[PDB]
C-alpha cells in the first residue's frame, strides 16, 4: 500500500532531520566556544585591565604611559615616542667656558658628547695664594708682611728696604762695596783708612816737630845762661 | 494509524522549535563576533577599522621615524629608540691643562663631574690688577717696580741688579758703622776724622 | 482521505524544514569565515609571534622589550615608559665646582641644561709656573735661581742682595749716592774731597814750617 510506504518515508526523513539538527547544535556550540576563547585571548593579550563582562560586552584596555591615559595601543605608542624625543632633548647636558677657562667639545665613540675643560694660558684674577706667598693687586707678600714687594718697592720687616724714597740699610752694615770711582759713589772703610794713615803721619810729624822745638828752647836757654 | 500521525505531528512541532532556537543561537554568536572584532579594532587603534564587507583593515603605527603594521614591531622600534637616545644623551666631562675632573654617581644614578684646578699651575701669565706674573718675572704697574732675571728696578728710583746697586740720587739711610774694609762708611765715621783734623789745625795754630 | 491529506501536509512541512536546514548550514559557514577574519586579524596585529593554530585555537604574543619579558601589550608599554623615565634620569649629567672653580647652571633654548665653568677670583694653589718664573711657598724664583725672593729677602746669584742680614753690594760699586745728611747716612767719594784737600793744605803748612825750623837751626 502507498500509505504504509509513505509513513515509512516520512519517518526516515524525520530521523535524518533529527540527526542533522544534532550535528548543527554541535557546530554552533563549538563555534560559540571558539569565539569565547578568542575574546579571552584578546583581553589577556591586550592587558590594560581589559575584561569580558557578564552581559557579553567587553571593556577595552586603559593604558597609563607618559603621564596620561590612553584607551588604545596606538595612542600609547605615540605617547611613548613623544616622551622619548623630549627626554632625549632635555637630558643632553652641555658645558661652556667662563673667565680663565677653555672648553673643547668633541664626540665620544658612542656618539655622546665630551667636554674637555682646561684653563686659559693667561689668567686674570684678584689673587693667587701659594702657601705663605700671596700675589695680588698690591704686589707680592711673603709671610705675615715679612717681605713686601709693592708699587713703591721692596721692604723687609726688621731689615733693609729699597723703595722710591731711597735705600734703607736697616741699622746694619752694607758689605762688599767695591772702591768708589765716581764722586757720587759710596766709599768703603779701606778708602777711609787710607786717609787715616796720613793723619797718623801728620801727628807723628807734629810730635817730632814739638820735641825739636823743645830741644831748640832748651838750647836757647843754655845759650843765654 | 492515526496515533502515528499525531506522533509525527508532535515530532515536527518539536523540530520546528529546535530550528527556531538554533536560528536564535546563530544570531547571538554573530553578535559575539561583532563585539570581538570591534573591540579588537578599537583597542588596537592606529586607524584600524572593520569594513562594511566584513574585512578588517589592520593598524598602522608610526613610531621612531618608521611605519609598523603590528604591535610587536612598534614596541621593538621604541625599545631601540630609547636605548640610542639614552646612549647619545649622556654627556661626559674630561680634564685638560691645569684642570682635574672627578667623576661620581649622583643620587638618582646620573653622573656628576667635579671640576677643580690642578694644585700646580703652568701658564703663560697671571694678572692681578696692576701686578703681572710672567716669564720675565714680576711687574707692578706700568713698569713702576720690576723684578726680573737681572734683579730689582724701581722707575725713577733706586735699583739692585746684577750690575750693582744704584741709590737713585738719594741718601742711603740707617747705615751701621763700617767694620770690615769693604763695608760702607757713614757720616759720623767721617765726622770723627773731621774732628781730628780740627785738632791738628788747632795744634798748628798753637805752633 | 483526511489521512492522505494530513500525510501530504506533513511531507510539505518536511520539505520546507529541509530547506531551512540548508540555509542554516550556509549561515553557520558565513559565521565561520568571519571568525577566521577575526582570529587572523588579531594574530597579525599583535605580532610577538602570535599564531592562529590549524586546530582552532590561538597562541598569544610574547614581547621582549626593556630587557624583560612581556605576555601582554600593557606590560610592554609600562616597561617602555619606565625605560624612558630611567634613561631620562640617568643620562642627565651634572657638573659641580671643586677647588678654585665656579660653576653656573642655566637653561639651553631646548630646555636642556648648560654648565658654565669659570675659575674663582682668588686662587689657592701649591705653585704657579710661568715660563722661567715660579711662584710657590718659598716665594718667587726667576731662572735657574738667578734671582730669588723669599722670606729673608732678595738675592741675585753672582750679584748683590737685600736680605734680613743686610745689604750686600756684591763686590760692585754703589752708585748715585746723594750726600749724607744724618750721622747714619752713607757718604760718597765727593764728600771726602774737601777733607783730602785739607790734608794737603796741612801738609804744605807742615813742610814749610819744617824747613823754616831748619833755617832757624842753621
Amino acid at each position: 500500500k502507498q500509505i504504509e510506504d509513505k509513513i515509512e518515508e516520512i519517518l526516515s526523513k524525520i530521523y535524518h532531520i533529527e540527526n542533522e539538527i544534532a550535528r548543527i547544535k554541535k557546530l554552533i556550540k563549538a563555534v560559540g566556544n571558539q569565539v569565547v576563547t578568542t575574546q579571552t585571548t584578546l583581553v589577556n593579550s591586550l592587558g590594560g585591565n581589559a575584561k569580558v563582562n557578564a552581559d557579553g560586552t567587553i571593556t577595552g584596555p586603559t593604558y597609563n604611559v607618559a603621564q596620561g591615559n590612553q584607551t588604545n595601543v596606538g595612542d600609547a605608542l605615540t605617547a611613548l615616542d613623544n616622551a622619548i624625543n623630549t627626554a632625549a632633548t632635555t637630558s643632553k647636558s652641555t658645558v661652556s667656558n667662563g673667565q680663565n677657562i677653555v672648553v673643547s667639545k668633541s664626540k665620544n665613540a658612542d656618539g655622546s658628547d665630551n667636554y674637555e675643560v682646561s684653563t686659559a694660558k693667561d689668567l686674570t684674577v684678584d689673587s693667587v695664594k701659594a702657601g705663605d706667598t700671596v700675589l695680588n693687586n698690591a704686589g707680592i707678600t711673603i709671610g705675615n708682611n715679612a717681605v713686601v714687594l709693592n708699587n713703591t718697592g721692596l721692604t723687609i720687616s726688621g731689615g733693609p728696604s729699597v723703595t722710591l724714597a731711597g735705600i734703607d740699610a736697616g741699622n746694619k752694615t752694607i758689605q762688599n762695596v767695591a772702591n768708589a770711582v765716581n764722586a757720587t759713589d759710596a766709599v768703603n772703610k779701606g778708602q777711609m783708612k787710607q786717609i787715616e794713615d796720613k793723619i797718623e803721619e801728620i801727628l807723628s810729624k807734629i810730635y817730632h816737630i814739638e820735641n825739636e822745638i823743645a830741644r831748640i828752647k832748651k838750647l836757647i836757654k843754655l845759650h843765654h845762661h
Side-chain angles (χ1 to χ4, degrees), chain A residues 3-28 30-192 194-197 199 202-204 206-214 216 219-220 222:
Chain A
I3 309 165
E4 53 195 16
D5 293 337
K6 270 174 172 301
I7 296 288
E8 191 173 10
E9 179 73 47
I10 285 173
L11 292 174
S12 176
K13 281 172 178 177
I14 282 176
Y15 180 74
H16 284 283
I17 286 175
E18 292 173 350
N19 292 353
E20 290 271 30
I21 294 315
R23 244 229 176 94
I24 294 167
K25 269 167 152 170
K26 286 192 172 185
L27 261 187
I28 299 178
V31 179
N33 296 0
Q34 183 182 4
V35 161
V36 153
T37 308
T38 300
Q39 300 187 329
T40 300
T41 297
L42 174 62
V43 151
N44 292 338
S45 301
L46 292 173
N49 292 332
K51 40 118 181 181
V52 176
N53 307 116
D55 52 17
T57 72
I58 308 178
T59 53
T62 167
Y63 303 119
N64 326 90
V65 302
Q67 308 305 308
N69 290 290
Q70 306 78 27
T71 61
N72 63 85
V73 178
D75 288 346
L77 295 166
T78 293
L80 290 169
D81 209 30
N82 294 330
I84 261 302
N85 301 335
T86 301
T89 291
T90 60
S91 291
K92 197 181 180 63
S93 296
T94 65
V95 184
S96 75
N97 78 277
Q99 182 65 55
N100 296 333
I101 290 297
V102 172
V103 171
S104 174
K105 171 187 180 190
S106 67
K107 296 187 178 292
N108 293 317
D110 58 20
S112 59
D113 293 322
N114 185 77
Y115 296 90
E116 178 181 67
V117 184
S118 300
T119 65
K121 282 172 170 291
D122 304 281
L123 312 183
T124 302
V125 290
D126 283 353
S127 67
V128 178
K129 182 184 191 300
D132 285 315
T133 299
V134 172
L135 161 67
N136 55 29
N137 174 72
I140 298 295
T141 304
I142 301 170
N144 187 6
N145 265 32
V147 174
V148 173
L149 186 69
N150 58 36
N151 63 3
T152 72
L154 174 64
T155 300
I156 306 171
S157 180
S161 64
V162 180
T163 71
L164 248 174
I167 299 177
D168 182 343
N171 295 335
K172 289 183 178 301
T173 57
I174 297 177
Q175 308 183 28
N176 297 315
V177 180
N179 291 339
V181 181
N182 311 279
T184 55
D185 293 347
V187 272
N188 61 44
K189 190 174 185 301
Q191 300 181 270
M192 190 182 63
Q194 179 177 358
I195 284 180
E196 292 174 342
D197 286 31
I199 293 290
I202 287 177
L203 249 57
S204 274
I206 292 181
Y207 166 79
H208 282 84
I209 259 188
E210 289 179 359
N211 208 330
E212 195 69 272
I213 284 298
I216 292 294
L219 291 181
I220 297 301
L222 289 177

